[PDB]
Design a protein around this ligand. Structure first.
Ligand SMILES: [Mg+2]
Ligand SMILES: [Mg+2]
Ligand SMILES: [Mg+2]
Ligand SMILES: [Mg+2]
Lengths: 127, 212, 151, 99, 100, 83
RNA sequence: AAACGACGAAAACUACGCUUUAGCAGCUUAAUAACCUGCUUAGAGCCCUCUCUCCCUAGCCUCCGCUCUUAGGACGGGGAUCAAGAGAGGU
RNA sequence: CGCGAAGAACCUUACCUGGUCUUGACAUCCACGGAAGUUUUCAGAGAUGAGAAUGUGCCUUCGGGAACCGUGAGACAGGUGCUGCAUGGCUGUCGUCAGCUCGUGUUGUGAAAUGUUGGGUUAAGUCCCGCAACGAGCGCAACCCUUAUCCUUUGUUGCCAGCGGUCCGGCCGGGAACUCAAAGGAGACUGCCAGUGAUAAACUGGAGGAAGGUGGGGAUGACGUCAAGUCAUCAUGGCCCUUACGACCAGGGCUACACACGUGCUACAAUGGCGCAUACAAAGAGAAGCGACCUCGCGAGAGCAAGCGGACCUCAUAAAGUGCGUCGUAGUCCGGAUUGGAGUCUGCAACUCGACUCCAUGAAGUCGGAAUCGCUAGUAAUCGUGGAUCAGAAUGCCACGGUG
């Protein structure tokens, strides 16, 4: 059973262990609602199983560990996708046809010397 | 003041270091001072023999000094005892037990310091500066090198105005991060002042970096 | 950019109901990265407006936006320090964006107990062409159409 | 029960130093655990290269420190002597623990 | 690199490395409340007429090679201007320009 | 400040001079050069000329200064208005 | 306000030099040739230094730090000289 | 112009005020004498004068030697004094802007030109074509450092996919699928299909793809310009002071002031402050050290104090977020400065001149003219944390991630 994935996004990292049965999503021990506050996030982590129809026909079990709701919220999706693919692979299409298969590389640049926040520059004293 | 120092950017690619023992934030100021003192004593002791590089190591509370020269005869001396005689004084300077090694270079005119040397000597003994420059260029070119850029600053040929002059034969890259750029600088003391001599030498393309 | 001419970026599909218009409204109403409370406020206001108008939430939002939808942007393409502006027609995407920006700006302009209540009260006026959005549209259109000899 | 912590700056020489002890153990004994590379410590420093006044000329350098573990759980009569009779190369540092 | 200032600094070490035990025990005694007022007062009065310039926290950390009184670094014991030329020449086992 | 149990910082010599003044009963000012020294109650009733580099400024110490430094009564700058 | 241009055509250690051999390269129609070159090695011309071919002795050494002492090996101690050959190297 | 200064109470740091000096505080040197040296006694604020209690530390022919003190000058010191219009070295700007040159050939009697120009294209003298141009160097890019998909190796201080006991804690029994740890690689190259373009270069779409056109960030600053800035990091040819510009320590002042200015933090209050569950980071520093607990303190921290050169312990229950309550538009339960006093950290000493604390007064200010500056994507903008300087003394500096 256990089809697995490893979603990543920002400085986060997931670990989805899909299997066959009934919702029962459970993240880092807590259940979805308990774990994710920003209800928004509680939808990114259910989006993939919506483009298919396994929202209520499969199980799950994740354990994300890095970052913040910021992107931990997302790493789940990536993974839930990589592993969904290993359930049938015919889904690759729809899932790519929705952006859920790419890992966003958007990172966070470095404070460069002289600047003050990566890009922002000390105000210039006019003349 | 415009170009970057090439050795400090070629340290981690091809060019070896001159000090790579192991200290922890306590004795490296002392180790650095000891290395500087032994190098400045070696220069004064072998000002006649052409000496280019001095490397240091500290394995297990003991100092090893390796000298890369072209005239080991003077330093060795008769019966092979002057090397030990000066090892005694360098051990006294360094405190910890000391040993020295010689890495005599065959055809060393491709060494930056030894190619920047003896032209200072000709300038000191008032040989023509242009003759010295062209002789240095031809000597550095005849050994198979692919380019030497030597910079001469201050009173060319014992002049009265500090001017800037530089010759360039072949190709001497400075932005390529794979090209072996041997760089050094020396000074000449004359009756009219001081002159600076900076030398870059482009050995050729070296792929694979370290580990030969 | 003089040479680099880029297209238009894509936004999230707003998984609350699913609408690019709603996603754009949310991401322009939010400030200081407070998208969570911005979404809560806008969704509460829209759900109240649905019952207050009798229609669906998305349809009531779309028609309210259309009823206050502008047509002309008054830009400053003057040749120098001399004041010489110019009105021009607006593309549909920037038109919708400007209309919803005016809506969310009137939301901040008019104060009440909560921003959700302000948004609900201002949408209940934009439904029958009242409030601040329609007034601003009229005030921009009068000065954009009164200057026709200047091309 | 006996282990050696290797500390260096060069992965092209610390690996040779590790090989020269793991092969020695596998020759005059057995039951090795291989080289375990610990997270290397990198210390960064920003240095101004302005002699008198220039608050823009900065260089960002970093010092590396690579750590490896070589633990031989079961020693023979010859393992300790073979791993202590070594002519260790310069630059690397050994912290040996024989509990 | 003033010669006059280069001797006071070494005196502040050659004198501070000698009074270590007496100062340590005096600090421990006057820091532990389980003491006597007269003894503590006599101890502090004896400590204060000890040479002033022999105190540990009365010498500024001076650079090793050039003695620049600013920018002294614990890691190298050298100022920025000298550590630049040291790391650029390559005498510091591991100092390479960096890029995160 | 200083620890409560460490004690004040009156000088070796200053204490000797004030003891001499108090059992000799002299009205002449006692000049002192210390500036970071504290005050003792036994100096009440004496004139102390404290030195700050410019002049030996006099202090007729009251019974209202024990727990502070005697140098607070003698500034060193010279300024009583821009104009 | 100024800024000329002449003679490694007065090669400034020989790195022992001194000899000589194959190829490379700058030269140009292709080449050679001087050498303009470094560059692998060959042998001895010719000054050389050291261990030698001398004999005596069996010296000899090494884990225990001392020892008659044990498989053993590349292990090896004193005195004048070198006739001609042989290993290295060049203060 | 938040510049050196990566942290001026004394010390400090070059400035000021009183006093001591002279081959001097610190360098080589002779005639010799005392082992160097440890505790205290005293006059002076101090600068350094007297001195005693003492030690005779290892060694040649003992017409003694190293080491350290002491005196006598002369051979010497010393200068943060100046000259960045003598300079070396270094740095900033023009400017990571894209140009700056050379060899041969050709053209013109010649100075000189071509190449380097012209169309497409680009970030580019980047690529193509044409054209007496052909090539080359410094040059634009790459080779250098990280991120983004995947492979293997090694599995501790880390993971529990599966199995078991289980104090419900990965505690170990175990293991190397994974996240992580460091080493070697596959890997995005216009590689493709279509259009446009000159049957080119290229640009635009789409397909695969983890990523697409440089995939995404950083160092690398081309000949040259600014008598550009530092003889105050340093060295340095000349002037210079040689019984003081050298040198001595204590106390002040570098921190002050009717003022004007660069920059930033702090606030304007309903997305905002008051409090009570509650959540997710990375990377770091640690032995004259980092410093868990505990007893306490309304609070700073006091005492006792485990472990750890550390994938082990500390700094360090991170917040914004989230669910509740609450306040209601008011100089405000906003805003936290000035003030009197209180202790605490800290270093011999915080009146000049530290920071922390909490009780108390609770300023200004309520989005600010003309002007003006920064940003094109995980960037603006907000929130907190970390790092170096240093006895402590960051709204400055350098980094780190969250939201977005
Ligand atoms: Mg000169
Ligand atoms: Mg063109
Ligand atoms: Mg593509
Ligand atoms: Mg300090």
């Amino acid at each position: 059973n256990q089809y697995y994935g490893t979603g990543r996004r920002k400085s986060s990292a997931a670990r989805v262990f899909i299997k066959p049965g009934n919702g029962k999503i459970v993240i880092n021990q807590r259940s979805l609602e308990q774990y994710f506050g920003r209800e928004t996030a509680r939808m990114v982590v259910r989006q993939p199983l919506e483009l298919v129809d396994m929202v209520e026909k499969l199980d799950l079990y994740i354990t994300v560990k890095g970052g913040g709701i910021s992107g931990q919220a997302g790493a789940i999706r990536h993974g839930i996708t990589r592993a969904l693919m290993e359930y049938d692979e015919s889904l690759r299409s729809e899932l790519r046809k929705a952006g859920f298969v790419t890992r966003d590389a958007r990172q966070v640049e470095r404070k460069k010397v002289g600047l003050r926040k990566a890009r922002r520059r000390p105000q210039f004293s006019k003349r | 003041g415009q170009k970057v120092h090439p050795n400090g950017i070629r340290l981690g690619i091809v060019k070896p270091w001159n000090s790579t023992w192991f200290a922890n934030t306590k004795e490296f100021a002392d180790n650095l001072d000891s290395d500087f003192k032994v190098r400045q004593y070696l220069t004064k002791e072998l000002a006649k023999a052409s000496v280019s590089r001095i490397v240091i190591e500290r394995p297990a509370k003991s100092i090893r000094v390796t000298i890369h020269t072209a005239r080991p005869g003077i330093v060795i001396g008769k019966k092979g005892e002057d090397v030990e005689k000066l090892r005694k004084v360098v051990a006294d300077i360094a405190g910890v037990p000391a040993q020295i090694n010689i890495a005599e270079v065959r055809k060393p005119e491709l060494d930056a310091k030894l190619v920047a040397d003896s032209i200072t000597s000709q300038l000191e003994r008032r040989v023509m500066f242009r003759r010295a420059m062209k002789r240095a260029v031809q000597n550095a070119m005849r050994l198979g090198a692919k380019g030497i850029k030597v910079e001469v600053s201050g009173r060319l040929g014992g002049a009265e105005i500090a001017r800037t002059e530089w010759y360039r034969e072949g190709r001497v890259p400075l932005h390529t991060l794979r090209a072996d750029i041997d760089y050094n600088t020396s000074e000449a003391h004359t009756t009219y002042g001081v002159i600076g001599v900076k030398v870059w030498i482009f050995k050729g393309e070296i792929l694979g970096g370290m580990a030969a | 950019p003089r040479r680099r001419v880029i297209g238009q970026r894509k936004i999230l599909p707003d998984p609350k109901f699913g609408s690019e218009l709603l996603a754009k409204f949310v991401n322009i109403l939010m400030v200081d990265g407070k998208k969570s409370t911005a979404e809560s406020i806008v969704y509460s206001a829209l759900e109240t407006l649905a019952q207050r108008s009798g229609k669906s939430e998305l349809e009531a939002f779309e028609v309210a936006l259309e009823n206050v939808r502008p047509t002309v942007e008054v830009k400053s393409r003057r040749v120098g320090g001399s004041t010489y502006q110019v009105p021009v027609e607006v593309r549909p995407v920037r038109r919708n964006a400007l209309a919803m920006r005016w809506i969310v700006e009137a939301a901040r302009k008019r104060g009440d107990k909560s921003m959700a209540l302000r948004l609900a009260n201002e949408l209940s006026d934009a439904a029958e062409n009242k409030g601040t959005a329609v007034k601003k549209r009229e005030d921009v259109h009068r000065m954009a159409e009164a200057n026709k000899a200047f091309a | 029960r006996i282990r050696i912590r290797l500390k260096a700056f060069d992965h092209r020489l610390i690996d040779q130093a590790t090989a020269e002890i793991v092969e020695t153990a596998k020759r005059t004994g057995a039951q090795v655990r291989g080289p375990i590379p610990l997270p290397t410590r990198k210390e960064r420093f920003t240095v101004l290269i302005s002699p008198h006044v220039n608050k823009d000329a900065r260089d960002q350098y970093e010092i590396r420190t690579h750590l490896r573990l070589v633990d031989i759980v079961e020693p023979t009569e010859k393992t300790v002597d073979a791993l202590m009779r070594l002519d260790l190369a310069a630059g690397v540092d050994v912290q040996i623990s024989l509990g | 690199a003033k010669q006059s200032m280069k001797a006071r600094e070494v005196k502040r070490v050659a004198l501070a490395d000698k009074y270590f035990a007496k100062r340590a025990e005096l600090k421990a005694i006057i820091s532990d409340v389980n003491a006597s007022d007269e003894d503590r007062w006599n101890a502090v009065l004896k400590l204060q007429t000890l040479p002033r310039d022999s105190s540990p926290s009365r010498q500024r950390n001076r650079c090793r090679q050039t003695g620049r009184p600013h920018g002294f670094l614990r890691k190298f014991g050298l100022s920025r201007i000298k550590v630049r030329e040291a790391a650029m020449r390559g005498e510091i086992p591991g100092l390479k320009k960096a890029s995160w | 400040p200083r620890s409560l149990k460490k004690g004040p910082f009156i000088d070796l010599h200053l204490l000797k001079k004030v003891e001499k003044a108090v059992e000799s009963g002299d009205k002449k000012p006692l000049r002192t050069w210390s500036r970071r020294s504290t005050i003792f109650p036994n100096m009440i009733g004496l004139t102390i000329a404290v030195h700050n580099g410019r002049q030996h400024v006099p202090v007729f110490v009251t019974d209202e200064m024990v727990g502070h430094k005697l140098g607070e009564f003698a500034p060193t700058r010279t300024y009583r208005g821009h104009a």
